[PDB]
Amino acid sequence: MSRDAPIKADKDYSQILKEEFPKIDSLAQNDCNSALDQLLVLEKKTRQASDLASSKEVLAKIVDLLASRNKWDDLNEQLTLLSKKHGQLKLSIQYMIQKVMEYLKSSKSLDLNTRISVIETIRVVTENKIFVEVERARVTKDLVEIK
Amino acid sequence: PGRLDRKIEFPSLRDRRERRLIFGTIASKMSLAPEADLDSLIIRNDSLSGAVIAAIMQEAGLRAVRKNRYVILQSDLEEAYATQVKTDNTVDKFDFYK
Amino acid sequence: GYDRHITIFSPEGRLYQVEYAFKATNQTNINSLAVRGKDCTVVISQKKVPDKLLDPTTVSYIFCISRTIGMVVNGPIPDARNAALRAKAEAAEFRYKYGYDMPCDVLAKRMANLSQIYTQRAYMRPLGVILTFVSVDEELGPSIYKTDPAGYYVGYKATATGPKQQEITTNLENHFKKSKIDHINEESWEKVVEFAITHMIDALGTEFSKNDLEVGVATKDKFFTLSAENIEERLVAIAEQ
Amino acid sequence: EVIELPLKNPEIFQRVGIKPPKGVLLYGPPGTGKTLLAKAVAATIGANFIFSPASGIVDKYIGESARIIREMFAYAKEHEPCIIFMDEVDAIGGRRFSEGTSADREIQRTLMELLTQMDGFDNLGQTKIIMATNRPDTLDPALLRPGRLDRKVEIPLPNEAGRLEIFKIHTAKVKKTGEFDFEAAVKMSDGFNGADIRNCATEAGFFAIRDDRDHINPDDLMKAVRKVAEVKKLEGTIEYQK
Amino acid sequence: GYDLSNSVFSPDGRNFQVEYAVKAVENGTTSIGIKCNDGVVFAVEKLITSKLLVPQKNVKIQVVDRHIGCVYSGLIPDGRHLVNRGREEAASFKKLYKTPIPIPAFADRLGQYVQAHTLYNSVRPFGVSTIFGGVDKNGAHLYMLEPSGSYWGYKGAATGKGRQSAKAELEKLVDHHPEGLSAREAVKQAAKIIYLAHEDNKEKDFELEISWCSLSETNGLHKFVKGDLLQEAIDFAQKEIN
Amino acid sequence: ADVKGVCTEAGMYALRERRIHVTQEDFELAVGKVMNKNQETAISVAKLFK
Amino acid sequence: VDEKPTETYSDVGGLDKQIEELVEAIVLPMKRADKFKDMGIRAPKGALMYGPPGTGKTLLARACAAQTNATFLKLAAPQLVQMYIGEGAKLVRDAFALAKEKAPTIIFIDELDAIGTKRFDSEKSGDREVQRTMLELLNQLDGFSSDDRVKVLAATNRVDVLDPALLRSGRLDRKIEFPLPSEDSRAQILQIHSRKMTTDDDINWQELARS
Amino acid sequence: TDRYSFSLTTFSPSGKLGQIDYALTAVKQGVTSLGIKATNGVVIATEKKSSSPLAMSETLSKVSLLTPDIGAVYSGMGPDYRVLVDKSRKVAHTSYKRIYGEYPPTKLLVSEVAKIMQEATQSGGVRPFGVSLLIAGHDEFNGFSLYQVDPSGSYFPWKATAIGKGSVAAKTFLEKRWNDELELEDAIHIALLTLKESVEGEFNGDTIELAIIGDENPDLLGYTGIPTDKGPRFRKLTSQEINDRLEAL
Amino acid sequence: GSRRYDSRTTIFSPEGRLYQVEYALESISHAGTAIGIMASDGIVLAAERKVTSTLLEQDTSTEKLYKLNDKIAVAVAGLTADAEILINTARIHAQNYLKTYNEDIPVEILVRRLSDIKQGYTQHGGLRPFGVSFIYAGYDDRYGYQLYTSNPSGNYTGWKAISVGANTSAAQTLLQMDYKDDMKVDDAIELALKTLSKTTDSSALTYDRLEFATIRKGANDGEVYQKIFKPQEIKDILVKTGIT
Numbered sequence A: 001m002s003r004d005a006p007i008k009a010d011k012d013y014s015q016i017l018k019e020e021f022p023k024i025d026s027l028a029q030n031d032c033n034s035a036l037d038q039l040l041v042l043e044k045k046t047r048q049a050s051d052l053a054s055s056k057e058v059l060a061k062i063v064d065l066l067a068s069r070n071k072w073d074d075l076n077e078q079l080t081l082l083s084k085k086h087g088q089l090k091l092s093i094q095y096m097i098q099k100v101m102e103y104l105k106s107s108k109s110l111d112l113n114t115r116i117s118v119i120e121t122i123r124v125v126t127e128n129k130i131f132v133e134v135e136r137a138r139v140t141k142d143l144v145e146i147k
Numbered sequence B: 001p002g003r004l005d006r007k008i009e010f011p012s013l014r015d016r017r018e019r020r021l022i023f024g025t026i027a028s029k030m031s032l033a034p035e036a037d038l039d040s041l042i043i044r045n046d047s048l049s050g051a052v053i054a055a056i057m058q059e060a061g062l063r064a065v066r067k068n069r070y071v072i073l074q075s076d077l078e079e080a081y082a083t084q085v086k087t088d089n090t091v092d093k094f095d096f097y098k
Numbered sequence C: 001g002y003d004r005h006i007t008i009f010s011p012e013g014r015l016y017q018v019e020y021a022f023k024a025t026n027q028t029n030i031n032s033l034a035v036r037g038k039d040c041t042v043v044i045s046q047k048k049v050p051d052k053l054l055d056p057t058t059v060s061y062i063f064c065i066s067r068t069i070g071m072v073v074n075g076p077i078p079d080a081r082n083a084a085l086r087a088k089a090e091a092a093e094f095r096y097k098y099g100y101d102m103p104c105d106v107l108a109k110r111m112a113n114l115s116q117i118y119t120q121r122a123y124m125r126p127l128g129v130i131l132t133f134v135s136v137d138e139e140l141g142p143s144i145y146k147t148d149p150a151g152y153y154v155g156y157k158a159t160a161t162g163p164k165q166q167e168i169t170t171n172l173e174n175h176f177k178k179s180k181i182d183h184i185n186e187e188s189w190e191k192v193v194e195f196a197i198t199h200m201i202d203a204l205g206t207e208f209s210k211n212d213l214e215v216g217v218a219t220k221d222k223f224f225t226l227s228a229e230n231i232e233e234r235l236v237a238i239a240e241q
Numbered sequence D: 001e002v003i004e005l006p007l008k009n010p011e012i013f014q015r016v017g018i019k020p021p022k023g024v025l026l027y028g029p030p031g032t033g034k035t036l037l038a039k040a041v042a043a044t045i046g047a048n049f050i051f052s053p054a055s056g057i058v059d060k061y062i063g064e065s066a067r068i069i070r071e072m073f074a075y076a077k078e079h080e081p082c083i084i085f086m087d088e089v090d091a092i093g094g095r096r097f098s099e100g101t102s103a104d105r106e107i108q109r110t111l112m113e114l115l116t117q118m119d120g121f122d123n124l125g126q127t128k129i130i131m132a133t134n135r136p137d138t139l140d141p142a143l144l145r146p147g148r149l150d151r152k153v154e155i156p157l158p159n160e161a162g163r164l165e166i167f168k169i170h171t172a173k174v175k176k177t178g179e180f181d182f183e184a185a186v187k188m189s190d191g192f193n194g195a196d197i198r199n200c201a202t203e204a205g206f207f208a209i210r211d212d213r214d215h216i217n218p219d220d221l222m223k224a225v226r227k228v229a230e231v232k233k234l235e236g237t238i239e240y241q242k
Numbered sequence E: 001g002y003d004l005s006n007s008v009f010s011p012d013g014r015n016f017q018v019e020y021a022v023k024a025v026e027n028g029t030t031s032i033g034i035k036c037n038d039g040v041v042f043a044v045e046k047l048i049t050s051k052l053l054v055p056q057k058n059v060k061i062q063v064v065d066r067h068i069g070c071v072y073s074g075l076i077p078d079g080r081h082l083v084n085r086g087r088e089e090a091a092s093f094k095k096l097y098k099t100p101i102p103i104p105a106f107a108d109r110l111g112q113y114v115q116a117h118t119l120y121n122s123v124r125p126f127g128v129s130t131i132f133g134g135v136d137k138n139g140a141h142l143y144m145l146e147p148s149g150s151y152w153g154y155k156g157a158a159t160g161k162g163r164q165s166a167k168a169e170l171e172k173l174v175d176h177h178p179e180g181l182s183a184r185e186a187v188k189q190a191a192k193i194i195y196l197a198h199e200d201n202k203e204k205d206f207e208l209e210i211s212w213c214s215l216s217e218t219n220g221l222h223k224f225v226k227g228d229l230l231q232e233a234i235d236f237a238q239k240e241i242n
Numbered sequence F: 001a002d003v004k005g006v007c008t009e010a011g012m013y014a015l016r017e018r019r020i021h022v023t024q025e026d027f028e029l030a031v032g033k034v035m036n037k038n039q040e041t042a043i044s045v046a047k048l049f050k
Numbered sequence G: 001v002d003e004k005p006t007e008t009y010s011d012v013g014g015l016d017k018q019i020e021e022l023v024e025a026i027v028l029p030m031k032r033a034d035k036f037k038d039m040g041i042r043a044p045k046g047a048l049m050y051g052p053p054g055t056g057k058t059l060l061a062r063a064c065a066a067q068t069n070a071t072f073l074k075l076a077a078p079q080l081v082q083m084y085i086g087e088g089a090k091l092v093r094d095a096f097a098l099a100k101e102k103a104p105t106i107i108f109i110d111e112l113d114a115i116g117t118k119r120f121d122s123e124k125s126g127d128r129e130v131q132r133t134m135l136e137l138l139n140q141l142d143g144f145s146s147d148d149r150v151k152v153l154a155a156t157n158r159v160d161v162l163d164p165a166l167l168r169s170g171r172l173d174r175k176i177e178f179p180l181p182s183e184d185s186r187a188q189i190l191q192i193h194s195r196k197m198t199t200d201d202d203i204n205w206q207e208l209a210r211s
Numbered sequence H: 001t002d003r004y005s006f007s008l009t010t011f012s013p014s015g016k017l018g019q020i021d022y023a024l025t026a027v028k029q030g031v032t033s034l035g036i037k038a039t040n041g042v043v044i045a046t047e048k049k050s051s052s053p054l055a056m057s058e059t060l061s062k063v064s065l066l067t068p069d070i071g072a073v074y075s076g077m078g079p080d081y082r083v084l085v086d087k088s089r090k091v092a093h094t095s096y097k098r099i100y101g102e103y104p105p106t107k108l109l110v111s112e113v114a115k116i117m118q119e120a121t122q123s124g125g126v127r128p129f130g131v132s133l134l135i136a137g138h139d140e141f142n143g144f145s146l147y148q149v150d151p152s153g154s155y156f157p158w159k160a161t162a163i164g165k166g167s168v169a170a171k172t173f174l175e176k177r178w179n180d181e182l183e184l185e186d187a188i189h190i191a192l193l194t195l196k197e198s199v200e201g202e203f204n205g206d207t208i209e210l211a212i213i214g215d216e217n218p219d220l221l222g223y224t225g226i227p228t229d230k231g232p233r234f235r236k237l238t239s240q241e242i243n244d245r246l247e248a249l
Numbered sequence I: 001g002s003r004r005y006d007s008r009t010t011i012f013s014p015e016g017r018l019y020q021v022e023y024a025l026e027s028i029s030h031a032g033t034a035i036g037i038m039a040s041d042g043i044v045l046a047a048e049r050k051v052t053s054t055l056l057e058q059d060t061s062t063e064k065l066y067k068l069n070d071k072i073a074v075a076v077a078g079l080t081a082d083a084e085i086l087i088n089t090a091r092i093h094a095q096n097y098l099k100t101y102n103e104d105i106p107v108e109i110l111v112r113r114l115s116d117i118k119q120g121y122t123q124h125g126g127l128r129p130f131g132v133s134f135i136y137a138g139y140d141d142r143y144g145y146q147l148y149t150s151n152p153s154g155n156y157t158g159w160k161a162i163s164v165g166a167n168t169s170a171a172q173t174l175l176q177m178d179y180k181d182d183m184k185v186d187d188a189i190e191l192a193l194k195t196l197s198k199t200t201d202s203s204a205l206t207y208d209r210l211e212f213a214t215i216r217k218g219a220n221d222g223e224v225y226q227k228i229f230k231p232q233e234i235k236d237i238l239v240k241t242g243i244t
């Protein structure tokens, strides 16, 4: 955001960890926690831009697990925790959410998924004020049809 | 006197009972929260003139259009109450005149 | 006529000369946030230096008036120095004639009384500085007393000063509403610094650096300040919270 | 919401059986566009419009000011829908006198004649007043009362991204090579009035025109938002509002 | 009103009399202060108003103690009164605590004195800025004291008409050496930015004066730069500006 | 005029009571009403003065 | 209209910057209006000129007006202060209507210290003839008459007296100080005065300028 | 130089001393306070207010002790009371506790503080203190007494009085509620009930400051085994105690 | 600076007349009526308070009547605040005379001393003078009972019957018709009350708003007893003289 140092440096690191993208994947197949530990580091940066690149990796990791209801709770939770603290500006983390929210929709192929997914989505958006709120209502709305 | 032996001074201090009577007259014109307790508002108002209360119904029914109703509720009344009665700041000044 | 040009009463009963003093302490645009810990009192304040050719180390607003009692100043630095000099002199004097160092309460009251006298005199201008006095006394615990240019002071659970201080009030109010006590329940003074920095970022929206901060901590029976190196440890420790 | 909504549709206001909302008071800093907005509202609705300054009606001939607003009023009652723009009402403002001279007492009569037309035995119909005041502290509690005036519109400075919204209207008009420094520009022109953002664009085009091109390059603008910002704050209003 | 005296005050935070007094300093002689590693190197532009004058026989540099240079601009009598006062303060410190006064301690006392005259209407505020520093036991330091009663540490300072030129090159001097520079080299750089600040005074002619207090050369004593060293500085500055 | 003011004031009270004849009670109310105007400006120099 | 043909800037000696500023403010928009129009930016609403009397300002607007081919209007604010409210208000309104009519026009207003300061709103503040004429000036320079052909030049003695609301951008745009002549400038102003009479090698204008 | 010796307080052509009239305006901008004299004590009460919710009102006193048997309470300016309370204690010691070895009579103390007022309206450089004080006390020669100190430099004894912004209404309250015989207990209940109408905020015992000059407390005496001395007749009530009297309304 | 805010408060007018003294006489006309009548056996001082209220304790008040010394008391008409200074100066001065000559101060000496202070304040310092008028009742051996009025300029004038404060003209005119030199203290008590009933400062004159004091040589052995009557002893005399 500020200074001219974060734009370049942070981006530079995300490139370096994107060359180390196969490494994160291989470990994720052996145990979830090992690769998860990498996502934590990525989503602590100071430039908004370098987190765009990195919020692909957060979505991809849980896709490689395929997907686990227990693991689902944590990913959406970690995001909520990062939003209150900073998120690299509170406006920044809302576009991150928007990317991961498309995945929630298309994951859907159980009742089981649908139920867990509405519990995470309602909470996120109570402190947000954008298009996130339309999407929350819509996924909530799948459970309405079932109701 | 003899010019003007009758002299009526009009207060704004009023009475609790006086405020109930302004509300009723208004209520005939447009019912304000007719499914909820009116009487809270009466207690809460404590300086208001008849004018502020006329401004209340009219501003509430502005908010009626927004909310897209043809009826005024107590929520409309409470925001009508909140503002139009908090003008000036002298809070700071009176810290050192306490 | 002269009911606004000297300290005489007006038909309003309000001294306009005195009002003008409070309308000059927020024009330096320095915010402060002061919180009472469970064993300490921490005060952090702005130290915005926009120049290459001003030495930032000597730009300061935290002056040690006793070895145990710090003082943080919001408002013009000539008046700050005069009020600091006077306060130091009195604190020393109290040791000399009463056999123990001046309490925070009474040091606040003494500057408060001098401020009234300066607005009693019609040729003397009051010192236009808001003084926050932080300490840990042994008879009052962690304490904050904040005096103002008129000569009014009171104790505080926490307090803020500056133009944007209303935002700071919101954070503090929530904190003590939830805890249901008049202080922070944190038993490490370092973490009360970390908390203070967090609420400063929340209130003002501004991301701080070690050269925008200046930190004073009164622990029990000593007052110290953090250097910019030590303040950087705290800023790294926000990332570890 | 105050003005336009009961003029076009009084049908909703009669149906509910609420009184039509009437009176707005505008106050803000210099330069914020109360005039610009006065000029704007008049178009939107299409209602008949009398822009009259209030320092403009004053004459040493007593009851001449009272005469002027009374006729203005009679015209407005005929020409419905109509909004009467009383601009800079602060000129004939203030209250008291009767130890003043008869010029003041006339200003007090005019101020009072205002008072007659609105409420009394005359009323507003689909007439409507907007009063503009540049200082609310010259302005008097008799006209800040509910009665007169349902919504008291306090207009701030243009917000941080409000100022960025104004630059867009203006930089639209210009021919340029492409300017991408507009985000940067609004950080330097912070604490600005909208009158001075308009000045930001006029200065940038000065430098463009002097160099003999018709394009505003971004470098011309960077310099420009700094050149206005230094001198603005030096001679700044330092207005205080209620 | 609020500008008749200095204990009138205004809601604008201004005090008027004091701000007015800075205008004398801003039309004063160019004077600089360079914070060096080993000390400080002062230099002052001394205008030559006539050929009748005796060169290097009129000084604006008076020593305080044996180790504090002090050079000032604005009203010369008023500044000579302020320096006269601070020669007493240095003597008092030396009497009571048996040490030459430390540079931060010296600044504190002077600030109090200048504060006193802005708090009373029965005495007149000062209108001079002094630049003073030296070498003490806590290291070399540099301070400039405003007639308001404000001082700070400085890595470079300037005052007078040609302060614009001086300060701009002092930024570049700290960008030449971000790890600081020798006192000996700073002689030649003090010369250079007086010469560049004489382009604000190029309707006039000048005499270059340089004085230093540095540990490396003068052993923590304040002395004047003279003879061949002074002439070397002149020759250096001459080639750079050519 | 003040004297005259009593006569008229007195007939407000008698009228209401629905008794024509003026009485001591009609009088006591009537002098209290006319004196009210005067007592209030006389309590501010009779009390809270120096 | 009291236009006299151009005085000419050559003949208004010294003060190079003042001459530079007027060209930039007036002539450049009037001649190069087409470029200002295509861009859609506004041509200066006013330029404030302030500083002590006799700094040449009159001479300059009168030169500029002939060159730019706008009429020279003569308006002086200390006159417009009267005891009669009606009479005093009337000539402001007359001068505004007539200017727009005779437009493009350079209105040259002298000594706007008679519009005074308003900083207060108390009972007495001028009785509402001094406050009132400040607000009548604000409607001159308000964009309810097109001030892109009219160009308002005004002279005033100090602005420090005057309330700073009137002084902001679009009131008045450029804020231009006129200092005293310097040593070298004095010599130029002396020479042109002397140029008018017999001129001889005895006289040295520089010599006279230094004394 | 100094040449301020020309009195700031001076006569106006319509009579009255203009400066003290101005100062009295400031008393009717301040907080409301009242005092009822019972035949078995005196009660004085005032309202605590705060400009911040993070201000503590237990560090804020507006009823203060001058001597153990004489308390004071103000309405007016905060700063002006702050300085003048210290001077009241000081002159009580110099003029009767170093001369007659005891605390001054309530009559004596009131007179002396009115002189301090008087000389702050005499000579230049000093404008009055913009407070009115109720000085309730007890002496052993005239029993209970309630005084009201004016910013004029005069005093008046009262049977019950009020000062502050809501004084006029409050004194009409006390007029029917006062009687020839009263109890201290019922005096308190009147005082709180009256100050209910002069408080616009909270009405807790934490925000209502109450103090009695009732009767002696030998637990505040600080020593025992001297039966001759009587403890402090003054006793400031803690917040919990004030809450009990709120339930006793 | 200092001279900026001064207006030269105490100076002559073109008539010769001191602004602050002229102003001072207006403010004494605000303050209540005080009457003094010199009988051939005493001096009666009778004053109607400028404040009365049902909540005002007036039963311990002695706000107009103050004893300067054992044979000299004053009644006050003017600012109570201003008067307080002169009252304690008088006590000091009378005691000082007693200390040095072991003889009681004559009435002339005490009045003259106070008068000098009032003159002095307009003469130098820029000080406002005391805006009070006192009526001194005093006994001395040499001139017997002596009655004196002092004005805020600082000048004293003897009388036999006189009134200061409110309704000075009305009180004086009634006194001229009724006063006789054969009057006793008994007769003077009745006259004072009647005069105050016709110069009343509201619409009623009452005991509780009356302060009353005499100095009578009817105490045994030619001694003088100053008695300041309580309002219920005033009440007794109020029914005696038939005011009530």
Ligand SMILES: Nc1ncnc2c1ncn2[C@@H]1O[C@H](COP(=O)(O)OP(=O)(O)OP(=O)(O)O)[C@@H](O)[C@H]1O
Residues within 6 Å of the ligand: D029, D030, D031, D032, D033, D034, D035, D036, D037, D134, D166, D169, D194, D195, D196, D198, G138, G142, G143, G170
């Ligand atoms: N909302 C806006 N978008 C575009 N330009 C604007 C806007 N608001 C104001 N401006 C610009 O600023 C100028 C100044 O506004 P305007 O003349 O309405 O001032 P004002 O607030 O009425 O002051 P006064 O107190 O002198 O009456 C406008 O002419 C316009 O160029």
Ligand SMILES: Nc1ncnc2c1ncn2[C@@H]1O[C@H](COP(=O)(O)OP(=O)(O)O)[C@@H](O)[C@H]1O
Residues within 6 Å of the ligand: G011, G012, G013, G014, G015, G052, G053, G054, G055, G056, G057, G058, G059, G060, G155, G189, G192, G193
């Ligand atoms: N720069 C100049 N060169 C020559 N004479 C000048 C110059 N400036 C002013 N003067 C003389 O002084 C007179 C007054 O100046 P004028 O233009 O009328 O000024 P202003 O508007 O500043 O009051 C001119 O008529 C001219 O005689």
Ligand SMILES: [Mg+2]
Residues within 6 Å of the ligand: D034, D035, G142
């Ligand atoms: Mg406008």
Ligand SMILES: [Mg+2]
Residues within 6 Å of the ligand: G054, G057, G058
């Ligand atoms: Mg001219």
